[PDB]
Design a protein around this nucleic acid. Sequence first.
DNA 1: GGCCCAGCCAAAT
DNA 2: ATTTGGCTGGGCC
Lengths: 98, 99
Amino acid sequence: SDFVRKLYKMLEDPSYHSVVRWSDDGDSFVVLENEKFTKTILPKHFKHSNFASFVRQLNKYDFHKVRHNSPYGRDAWEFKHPEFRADRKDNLDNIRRK
Amino acid sequence: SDFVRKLYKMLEDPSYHSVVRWSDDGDSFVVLENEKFTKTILPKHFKHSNFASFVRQLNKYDFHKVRHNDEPYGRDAWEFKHPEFRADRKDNLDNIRRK
DNA sequence: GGCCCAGCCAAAT
DNA sequence: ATTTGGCTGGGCC
């Protein structure tokens, strides 16, 4: 998948660490800030600067937002797909448009 | 019931001029710095800080995002518009209903 | 009423 | 003709 491969490539660069990174477990990823992501990082990896079109694409590939009851950030967004993991770089094509 | 009046009230505040305000013609409103808007202004007036929800409510009330085309307020600006929602029509807010 | 996720068309490919 | 971006809507809670 084109989008998925690019999502994983994004999460390789540590310069982004404080803004968008893998979670501690490595089984989900966290968008910690929004503005610098939306303005600086989204454009460089995807064809938009619109956080919500990013979100929309995630739901199309069956990623789900993980709901907090605070753990990562006040206004952080965490997304998780069962197959999308830091250690499973091989299994990316298994993630596909619902 | 409450949304439209509060939205109108929000736009009565000039201190927010750089962030969110009425459009030149007073017939639509524009969010210019949605980070600042989202994190400072939204909670004040609607008690959440998620732009997506603000957008969702807007569509529920039949507001529409006004797609700009080359020739606005910045490309990261979001302009929203309802025929009956206007700077000079504080009297008409009841006719803006959940579609 | 906030919010996740999806419908549906257009804008790109 | 097919894919990707984005405005809008459905429905849980």
